[PDB]
Scaffold this active site. Structure first.
Site, PDB file in Angstrom:
ATOM      1  N   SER A  55       0.783  -1.240   0.000  1.00 56.00           N
ATOM      2  CA  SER A  55       0.000   0.000   0.000  1.00 56.00           C
ATOM      3  C   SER A  55       0.818   1.295   0.000  1.00 56.00           C
ATOM      4  CB  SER A  55      -0.962   0.012   1.187  1.00 56.00           C
ATOM      5  OG  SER A  55      -0.262  -0.077   2.410  1.00 56.00           O
ATOM      6  N   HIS A  60      -6.529  -4.069  -1.528  1.00 57.00           N
ATOM      7  CA  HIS A  60      -6.193  -3.030  -2.494  1.00 57.00           C
ATOM      8  C   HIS A  60      -6.297  -3.496  -3.948  1.00 57.00           C
ATOM      9  CE1 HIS A  60      -5.121   0.298   0.087  1.00 57.00           C
ATOM     10  NE2 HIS A  60      -4.457  -0.525   0.880  1.00 57.00           N
ATOM     11  N   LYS A  84     -12.975  -0.282   0.752  1.00 57.14           N
ATOM     12  CA  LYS A  84     -12.259   0.233  -0.397  1.00 57.14           C
ATOM     13  C   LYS A  84     -13.152   0.106  -1.631  1.00 57.14           C
ATOM     14  CE  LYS A  84      -7.801  -0.281   1.846  1.00 57.14           C
ATOM     15  NZ  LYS A  84      -8.480  -0.712   3.092  1.00 57.14           N
TER      16      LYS A  84
HETATM   17  C1  LIG Z   1      -4.077  -3.864   3.466  1.00 59.22           C
HETATM   18  C2  LIG Z   1      -5.148  -3.515   4.448  1.00 59.22           C
HETATM   19  N1  LIG Z   1      -5.792  -4.541   5.100  1.00 59.22           N
HETATM   20  C3  LIG Z   1      -6.765  -4.297   6.008  1.00 59.22           C
HETATM   21  C4  LIG Z   1      -7.169  -2.990   6.280  1.00 59.22           C
HETATM   22  C5  LIG Z   1      -8.275  -2.771   7.287  1.00 59.22           C
HETATM   23  O1  LIG Z   1      -9.471  -2.500   6.602  1.00 59.22           O
HETATM   24  P1  LIG Z   1     -10.629  -1.597   7.261  1.00 59.22           P
HETATM   25  O2  LIG Z   1     -10.470  -0.144   6.851  1.00 59.22           O
HETATM   26  O3  LIG Z   1     -11.873  -2.201   6.670  1.00 59.22           O
HETATM   27  O4  LIG Z   1     -10.624  -1.788   8.744  1.00 59.22           O
HETATM   28  C6  LIG Z   1      -6.541  -1.928   5.632  1.00 59.22           C
HETATM   29  C7  LIG Z   1      -6.929  -0.503   5.994  1.00 59.22           C
HETATM   30  N2  LIG Z   1      -6.409   0.444   5.037  1.00 59.22           N
HETATM   31  C8  LIG Z   1      -5.536  -2.202   4.694  1.00 59.22           C
HETATM   32  O5  LIG Z   1      -4.915  -1.193   4.020  1.00 59.22           O
END
Ligand SMILES: Cc1ncc(COP(=O)(O)O)c(CN)c1O
Ligand SMILES: Cc1ncc(COP(=O)(O)O)c(CN)c1O
Ligand SMILES: [Mg+2]
Ligand SMILES: [Mg+2]
Lengths: 398, 398
Positions: A185, A213, A244
């Site tokens: 990310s 992602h 997302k």
């Molecule tokens: C790779 C990844 N996995 C899990 C999450 C957690 O997801 P959530 O926003 O639904 O709590 C995120 C949050 N950006 C993330 O980037």
């Protein structure tokens, strides 16, 4: 001194940032949101280029109608756990939508993606077992490791070799969970899943891949990087989010393992929290099902990403990736001042991007992270490129 | 064997329960929900008496309208963290609603109550500090302790004396967090907060009180058990949820501490998750504000609770409390078979209550937990009492 004295440093660091005259990046308010790509921030019409709304589903008319209908028919909340009174019609629907999306027999929805990672990691790997993860894994993955009682084995970031060497030194008998992410990310580069999964299987480990992602836009069915890299049927568990591409809130894990649904019986972050509101699971169901065949959106998303990535690189910005490998385009700056000046100039000119500075990033890494939307128009992307050209010149980056 | 072999026992235990012929209590689906008190379960019209919808807010017309309007105006989700692109108009609104509700300068909203407890406990108390909690504290409180690096000090359930003795043996200098709950959720009895808070202050500890099970109906302003017991201005932090009286999903912590809002800068479950959907925070805002003055509902709730508690006790059911001290009425049964038979008879006759058996409860404790709603009618409560009389006789409990 008291329990909050430990925050004195962070308070001082925030004030130092604000002394530079910049808008507080941690306190931005979207006062109006006109569409997936347009907001009003500080009273100014602003193009959004810092959201994870990859497929523009948040204003989809079917998604919005499903949410309104659920509020009307089922009310604003469930007031209970999934293990008691909190499972309504739409919760069963959303789990079936995920089964259909991923082609799995198993699907467990959590109230957030964070809790899905926290819960699945801490529940699957117990005392005497191993969780093996990339050094730069998402915070929620690390927090799952902390919550559990397993042995934690970090491997050097993006290193197939270190994964192999580290796995190979572990005792053979205990069960092992290798946790990988499809997209990294921070910079928007892609994990070598094909190679890392082969290594995991050589050592008899189970594999969990986080495809937060990539959902809807990698692989023939949009299932993620693992699908794109030919690993269908080889991944034990896939974790994701509703926040997302799906465009709401929630988490999930899917699997074909025959005992998978038994995780509901043991998983504390599944059991000891209220289920999601009817409107949230209804919007998610509708969005997930549309994502299965959202080909026009997928093509737009990738077209937009390629145009932004190619355009920014051409201007002389240093990017996190040589090729456009995801819907995240990271612009790398020389120091914290340059990043903040660029971010402020873009914001004042009508563009929102995410800034990432230490300790969010590693020391010496200073980023503007752009995230593309399927509903950006070609015109908007050219406008954005023009804004980057103007800001980059004014600040002296390019 | 693999990572799921550890669930073989739980799988066997579930199958043993189902061999008795009972409906699976962990797989109930609300196929339709007509109102806060009426659902369709297994094709049958059923009175709901096992939800935490204490104030019946989930079908409130202002709450529903606010949710629909938010979907229309802001879309289905935020696609970002509160520290980046996820703070919309309605997130600022919901935090101000909490400030007004509790009379505090500080309010931090989390994506679930579970995460609020997980985050606040693991962030406030660090290495070399102490978290002191009741032996029978909610799972999320224990999970916060596990997530952090503090020393954990359990005290004997409901024991002012053991709290005092345990606190007094700790070194004086390090900062300390005493975590209490206003209502004990299992049996629906009330914590002696006045006495325990006095003890906490004697030893220089900060106090966190979880008022999830009291919001809107304890204290002059509905702030909770602490308010009812005269502790206004003495509680450092109050944690709660949006999933019970408020009627949606989410968590929060409020405080008057001047550095409180700095928790946003450090708290991993606040930072590393998407913010709540616009509709969720809009419904919560509207609900919270209405709860400030929901006097008719509050009176109905307590009237209903007193009628159910008094009626069940009069019939010869053994209850968790001698007097009606909360909106939870726990019926205590002699063994697991008696509990399941009672639960099934009630369900088949058109009433849903929550069953609690080991290991959800302590060994030897077998409960039916009834939770009252402000929108139950007197007629419904008498119908419920009639159903308990009939089931209790048929099973041989009374
Ligand atoms: C790779 C990844 N996995 C899990 C999450 C957690 O997801 P959530 O926003 O639904 O709590 C995120 C949050 N950006 C993330 O980037
Ligand atoms: C006392 C208590 N505190 C916190 C929580 C967590 O709240 P949520 O359902 O919003 O995650 C619960 C869940 N029942 C609870 O009972
Ligand atoms: Mg509009
Ligand atoms: Mg209706």
């Amino acid at each position: 001194r008291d329990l909050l004295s430990k925050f004195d440093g962070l308070i001082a660091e925030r004030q130092k940032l604000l002394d530079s005259g910049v808008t507080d990046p941690f306190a931005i308010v979207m006062e109006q949101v006109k569409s997936p790509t347009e907001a009003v921030i500080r009273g100014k019409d602003t193009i959004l280029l810092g959201t994870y709304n990859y497929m523009g589903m948040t204003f989809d008319p079917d998604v919005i109608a499903a949410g309104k209908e659920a509020l009307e028919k089922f009310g604003s909340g469930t007031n209970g756990s999934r293990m008691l009174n909190g499972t309504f019609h739409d919760h069963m629907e959303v789990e079936q939508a995920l089964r259909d999306f991923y082609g799995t027999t198993g699907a467990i929805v959590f109230s957030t993606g964070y809790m899905a990672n926290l819960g699945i990691i801490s529940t699957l790997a117990g005392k005497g077992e191993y969780v093996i993860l990339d050094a730069d894994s998402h915070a929620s993955i690390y927090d799952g490791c902390q919550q559990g009682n397993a042995e934690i084995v970090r491997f050097r970031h993006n290193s197939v070799e270190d994964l192999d060497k580290r796995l190979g030194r572990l005792p053979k008998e205990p069960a092992k969970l290798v946790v990988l992410e499809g997209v990294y990310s921070m910079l928007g580069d892609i994990a070598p899943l094909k190679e890392m999964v082969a290594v995991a299987k050589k050592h008899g480990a189970m594999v969990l891949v986080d495809e937060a992602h990539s959902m809807g836009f990698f692989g023939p069915n949009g299932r993620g990087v693992y699908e794109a890299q030919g690993l269908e049927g080889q991944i034990d568990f896939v974790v994701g989010t509703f926040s997302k591409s799906v465009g709401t809130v929630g988490g999930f894990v899917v699997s074909n393992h025959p005992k998978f649904e038994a995780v509901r019986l043991a998983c504390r972050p599944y059991i000891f929290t209220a289920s999601l509101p009817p409107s949230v699971v209804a919007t998610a169901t509708t969005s997930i099902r549309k994502l299965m065949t959202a080909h026009e959106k997928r093509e737009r998303l990738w077209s937009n990403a390629r145009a932004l990535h190619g355009g920014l690189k051409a201007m002389g910005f240093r990017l996190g990736t040589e090729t456009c490998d995801s819907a995240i385009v990271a612009v790398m700056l020389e120091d914290q001042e340059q990043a903040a000046m660029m971010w402020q100039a873009l914001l004042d000119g009508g563009l929102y991007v995410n800034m990432a500075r230490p300790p969010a990033t590693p020391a010496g890494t200073f980023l503007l992270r752009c995230s593309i939307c399927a509903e950006h128009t070609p015109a908007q992307i050219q406008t954005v490129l023009g804004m980057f050209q103007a800001a980059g010149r004014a600040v002296g980056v390019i």
